[PDB]
Amino acid sequence: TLNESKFDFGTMVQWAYDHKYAEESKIAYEYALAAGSDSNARAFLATNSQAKHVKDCATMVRHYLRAETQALSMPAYIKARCKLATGEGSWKSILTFFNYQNIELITFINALKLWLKGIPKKNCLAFIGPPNTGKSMLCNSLIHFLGGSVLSFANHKSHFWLASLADTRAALVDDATHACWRYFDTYLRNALDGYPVSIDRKHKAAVQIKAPPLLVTSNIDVQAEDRYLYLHSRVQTFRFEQPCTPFNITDADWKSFFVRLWGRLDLI
Amino acid sequence: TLNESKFDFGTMVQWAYDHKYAEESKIAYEYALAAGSDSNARAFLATNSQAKHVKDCATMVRHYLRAETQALSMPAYIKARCKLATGEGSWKSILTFFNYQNIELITFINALKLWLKGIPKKNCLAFIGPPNTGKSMLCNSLIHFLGGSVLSFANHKSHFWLASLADTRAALVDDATHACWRYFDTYLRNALDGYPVSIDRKHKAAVQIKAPPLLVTSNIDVQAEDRYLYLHSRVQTFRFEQPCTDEQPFNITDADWKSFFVRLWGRLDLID
Amino acid sequence: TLNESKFDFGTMVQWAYDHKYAEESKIAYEYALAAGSDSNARAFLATNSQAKHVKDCATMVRHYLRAETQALSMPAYIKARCKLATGEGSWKSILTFFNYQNIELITFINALKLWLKGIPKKNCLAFIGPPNTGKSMLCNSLIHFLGGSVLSFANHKSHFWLASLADTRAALVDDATHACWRYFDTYLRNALDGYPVSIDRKHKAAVQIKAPPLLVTSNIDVQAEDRYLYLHSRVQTFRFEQPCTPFNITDADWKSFFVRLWGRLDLID
Amino acid sequence: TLNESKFDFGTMVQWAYDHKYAEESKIAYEYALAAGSDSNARAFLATNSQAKHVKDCATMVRHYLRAETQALSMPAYIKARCKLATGEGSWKSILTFFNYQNIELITFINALKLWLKGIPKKNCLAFIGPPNTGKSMLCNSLIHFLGGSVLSFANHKSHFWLASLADTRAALVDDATHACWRYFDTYLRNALDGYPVSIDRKHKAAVQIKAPPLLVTSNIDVQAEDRYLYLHSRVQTFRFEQPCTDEPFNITDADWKSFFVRLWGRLDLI
Amino acid sequence: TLNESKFDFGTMVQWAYDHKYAEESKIAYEYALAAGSDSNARAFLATNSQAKHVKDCATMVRHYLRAETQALSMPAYIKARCKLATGEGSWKSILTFFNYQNIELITFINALKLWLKGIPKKNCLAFIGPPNTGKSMLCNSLIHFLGGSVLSFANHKSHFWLASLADTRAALVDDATHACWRYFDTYLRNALDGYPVSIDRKHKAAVQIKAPPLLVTSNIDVQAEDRYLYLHSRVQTFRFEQPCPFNITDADWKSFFVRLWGRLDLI
Amino acid sequence: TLNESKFDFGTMVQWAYDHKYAEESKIAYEYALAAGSDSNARAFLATNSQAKHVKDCATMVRHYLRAETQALSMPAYIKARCKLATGEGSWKSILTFFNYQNIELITFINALKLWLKGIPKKNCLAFIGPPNTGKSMLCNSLIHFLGGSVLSFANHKSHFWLASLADTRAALVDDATHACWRYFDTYLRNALDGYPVSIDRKHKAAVQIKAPPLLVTSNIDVQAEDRYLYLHSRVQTFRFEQPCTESGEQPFNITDADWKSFFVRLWGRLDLID
Ligand SMILES: [Mg+2]
Ligand SMILES: [Mg+2]
Ligand SMILES: [Mg+2]
């Protein structure tokens, strides 16, 4: 690598935006590479304030990306996500899986249609069963397709562990333990309902925002438990009982899924 | 988007304020687009300190907006909130819902009249019942119409969670648990009395303001419990016992409140 | 509002000080208005670092205002609280309330006189009686008039609860629970006796100071309970027996009270 | 407080130091008043970066006061505190009290002597007795004269409650409870033996220091208690039994000044 | 050292990067030394802003270093790690040791092949047994060879104790006590699984990132414990029963990977 | 003082480094004193950003001091520590003491030789016995000589209470209570082993570093206790049974010069050679 040797900020931002580079380290490094055949990248390594520029660039790209994502309605967004996916794919992969778990695909379609609209008390789908039934498998593939974020309950003692909810269009909590379910029960009923919530962000002001659609995987059946009574109404449960690993849903599978079931998932 | 090829900050703030953009994300993006015509927006994209300008702009805007909003009387405010509410709607759906819960709309009206003026011991309305009775949905629709804020007891361990009581004209604590009621019982006593309290910040300023009218929803009946005796006379309870467990469930909207308020403006002592 | 179009900061601060604006948002807004008729306010809107100037102006103002009030004598401070409070006012309001709860006015005037002077053992007046006898009512009204602060002792979690004491001329402990009294009994004798106490604050250094005068409200009669023997000589109880559900004390009432009884409260400056 | 109509920071810091103002709001307000008859104070209000200077200034003065207090030997330090002592009392006021509490001046003078040097196991003087025997009275008067600091065991749940030990030359832990004494036993053995303790400070990294001289008051006799065996050889105790109660004793700063000026020899402060 | 005496930042960074100096103190000091025979190092000591240059340099180097590590495939990465190792070595050292613990090397090769790919439920290998059975010994040597990071559960009450997971290609938790296993069970199943995980960085904002392969050493057999039921499926256990001290070097691992390249599916 | 009245930062740092002043208040005050006969110190008092320069100076010094301490090997480091010690001394002071505690000096030498190399499971020496047996006495004198740091278990609820491990070459925990041993057992086995650990530092970034050699003094005998089973293999215990005081005198007191004598004499057997 070379980092040695008039700089325009905007151009670097343009570049960063185009390549979807949102991360300070990647932006810095990847631009320093562009330096061999880019006079602006060359100029960037000539400035003594490159550190700040990398920082401001990431801020700037984050601003734009966030703003784009927020502007789109769910259909237009899924549309963009479909455009993004590549590879061989079939909704039949998804069908087969649900059929393997002895679930009619329509049951999922119905729930998914409403989940996507973020309708109160329907804003949370939970995939529940004994280990190795493709729960994490499925939810992760979908969250990936959608460009959703994973929430890490491991960081719940922090104020900003929910900060991504100010940006993403769907979110996942993977392997909700009893501690996890209780926290949700106590503090995050409104977020599970998909009502507005005050979201704390690092260098920014708090935003009040509709908590986006939620996914949860767990071994714990909330509907069956009396002590999670108040969650019964806001959580739709899909029970995955059958063992699997082979079964492997790609992005292209979801692309196929949404394209096939566009009308049937009500996406006007 | 295009973010490339002297700047005046005040001009950007003017634009942002007029368009009422107070989020950096939006200010950043939207101004970048306005670069084709408006050539201050063009100057903006040629500065190496774009990021700061966005930051500062959001600050500057939300300063002004907060400041006009405090300057308004509750009447004049609700007015702006009606002016802001769009779509087709009717107060009948509010009537329908209370009557559904076997409550006369006039019981609600009375309470609301006093609650809007923030009268001592009338400052907090609670909607209490078993799960699925329209508590959250009623309150949220109101708070939404009112432009109020939703406090999250999740962050309660840091007093900073009440920061927004400094800014907004009404607040909701959605789904109060015992823990949360106990919190009211020790701290927010003064809020339920009209005597000012001290609100803190991450950007530490440490002001003192009269507390905005509160809404609470809860599965816990406070009037029924002695460990919450103080709150009995200071919290007005509306018991919702009828469930709505059966495509889109029932929904109150901005327009529904808009008409509710235009129709009942008189009876609500909002006259000026 | 107009926010568009050489700037002198001190001038802005001067202005802000004059209008008593300590409020970033208010400052920002009000200056931008007073601007088609102030060369400096206009100049402010020309500057790119407006956001900084507002922040600094606030800081600067809250410094001056804070420091100017910290420097007053107790009498001078009350004279300030008197100027600051306006409205429909009579002390007759208070006198009848005391008469309703069967407390002689002079008992209270005296006690207050010595309380405002923060003499040890005279430093803490408790108001005691069963729920709903206007204890909060009265104390809040007084502390408000005086611009003091309100403290709630929760339990353990209340670690920083005394943090405001670092700063106010007076304070009120709202509904002292039994544990709150034990806290006094255990950790606060020095405060009551006129000695320095370390007061922990959030994200700044602890401070050592003489405890401001304290009002307390409680259902617990510390004079009666021998397990608080040590507070008996340090706390002066006013017993409120009569339930009230009309009475309402105001900033304007206290004003009249203080102006009327000025000579009798020994505030002679 | 007129604020309107080339600034040297030095001149300001100086002014703040001279007047021993360490606290921003005071510094700001007080300098603004000086501006009537002070060119640099006048130049200050002409600056756009006033807030920055007021901050810096506080930080600057805080640095100096803190570091000069640390730099002086215990005798020179006491010497300084004698110069600060205003009014006029007498060392006799102090002697009279000890006479009343039936304790030996000589015992005290020695204890204090060694306590002042912070000699291992001589570093902590307990003042023990039932309530209202003038324990707080005497200890606080001594701390005051000394420029000491009070530690509140109330704040012990934060470990920052000891922060001031990285600063004072003498410290008082008032009204020790059992909780507190076994705290000492548990955590502070090194403070008593004159070995190093890591004292955590809030906004900056912890420092290792030798704990300055310590006073304690308490209703609890550590020497008479078995669970504090370690403490017996490290804590020098004095029992006060005598009431101090009229709706009579008030040791002043001048009292202490006279005490030290007069027993200077006997305290080994040469 | 000498600290007194036109500065170019980029050259300093270049330098720091070349020497792989990533931390402020080292950078500052080591550069101040270069000052005798480097005009840019000389010019650095002439600036009144050297403090922030050292700071920014560190920032800039970790940007680059992180970015170049993240860019490499696991094969390409191990390749570079092999290039880095020096000295005398043999995979036999490793074979001998697994054989000593009565474990066929192929069992380990199979597990490692998958672990390196970060396959779900296969992302975590645990070395388990009574004290002094070369558990920490082996895991540490591997983590060293790989340039992986240590996690310190001692800091688990902080938000940033997992912050290295945003940078390393492999991680180790050494001596998981019961408290440690429980924390993992409660909060980090997905991390163990090697699914995407939101990782809180100190002054930057969080990143969503796939969790690197994991090594744990412990006296606690999770597989045998009913209360760690939910960990059974995501943790492959290697039981080290035999005591010992013997040592595995970088060059041993270099030998190991080179020899077993194809058998490890490193194309 | 006089705090009043062009500046070169490097020179102030040079100064601060030379005087090994690393701590902001000392740096500011001490330099303000140098102002009488130093034009750079005089210029410092003329700038408006003194507060910052003091701040940056401390940063810079800390950088240099840490960096130079980490660069040295253990031998070269002890070497520099010997150079630093002054006064009358003899290793016999040390011998006499161990002999007084009925311990052969060679037992300690053997342990120390390995402890200094920071060999796994040998990275921690605990001195254990009833009160007043010179445990803290000895450990502190050694830590002092080595320029090691003391960890204070009073601060253990903070992330940063271990922050010194990123800097010192030896470290001591004095008077380990039961709470203390348990914390070590639960959270800190591998640091007791002297394996790489992630040490969190306050304002800066966490650092991954080899945990330095450890000393512990305690009234609690971990080897005898079944509940500290897993500490048995990583802690070498020296039992001090004999009193080191009556509260007349205190006969045993090891100086820096005693250790200087100790290491110089026993350089070979501690394998601190080429
Ligand atoms: Mg799973
Ligand atoms: Mg609800
Ligand atoms: Mg191990």
Residue numbers in the entry:
A (entry chain B): 301 to 305, 310 to 549, 556 to 578
B (entry chain A): 301 to 305, 310 to 550, 554 to 579
C (entry chain F): 301 to 305, 310 to 549, 556 to 579
D (entry chain E): 301 to 305, 310 to 551, 556 to 578
E (entry chain C): 301 to 305, 310 to 548, 556 to 578
F (entry chain D): 301 to 305, 310 to 549, 551 to 579
Provide the authors' own sentences about this structure as they appear in the paper.
The papillomaviruses (PV) are small dsDNA tumour viruses of significant medical importance and the prototype of the group is bovine PV (BPV-1). The N-terminal half of BPV-1 E1 consists of a regulatory domain (residues ∼1–158) and a sequence specific origin of replication (ori) DNA binding domain (ori binding domain; OBD, residues ∼159–300), implicated in replication initiation. The C-terminal half (residues ∼301–605, the E1 helicase domain—E1HD) has helicase activity and can be sub-divided into the oligomerization domain (OD, residues ∼308–378) and the AAA+ adenosine triphosphatase (ATPase) domain that includes a flexible C-terminal acidic tail (AT, residues 579–605) required for helicase processivity. Crystal structures of the E1HD show hexamers with two tiers formed by the OD and the AAA+ domain.
To advance understanding of the mechanism of dsDNA strand separation we have used electron microscopy (EM) and single particle analysis to obtain structures of the full length BPV helicase E1 and two complexes of E1 bound to a RFJ end-labelled with protein tags. First, a structure of the purified E1FL–T30 complex examined by negative stain EM was determined with C6 rotational symmetry imposed during the initial structure determination. The E1FL hexamer structure, determined at a resolution of 18 Å, has a maximum diameter of 130 Å and a height of 100 Å and can accommodate ∼410 kDa of protein mass, in agreement with the predicted 409 kDa. The shape of the complex resembles a triple-tiered ring, with the middle ring having the larger diameter and the upper ring the smallest (left). There is a central tunnel (‘a’) that varies in diameter along its length: at the bottom of the structure (C-terminus) the tunnel is ∼20 Å in diameter; travelling upwards the tunnel ‘a’ forms a chamber within the HD area, which expands to 27 Å below sub-domain 3 (middle) and then it narrows to 23 Å in diameter at the entrance to the central tunnel formed by the upper ring. Third, available atomic coordinates of E1 domains were docked into the EM maps. The fitting resulted in a CCC = 0.72, which was reduced to ∼0.2 for the upper tier of the complex indicating a better consistency between E1HD crystal structures and the lower tiers of the E1FL structure. Notably, the data indicate that dsDNA enters the E1 complex through a tight side tunnel and not along the central axis of the hexamer as commonly assumed for E1 and other hexameric helicases, while the 5′ ‘passive’ strand exits the complex via a channel opposite the dsDNA entry tunnel. DNA unwinding is therefore taking place at the entrance to the helicase domain, inside and not outside the hexamer. Our observations therefore suggest a revision of the steric exclusion model proposed for E1 (20) where, alternatively, DNA strands are wedged apart within the hexameric assembly and not outside.
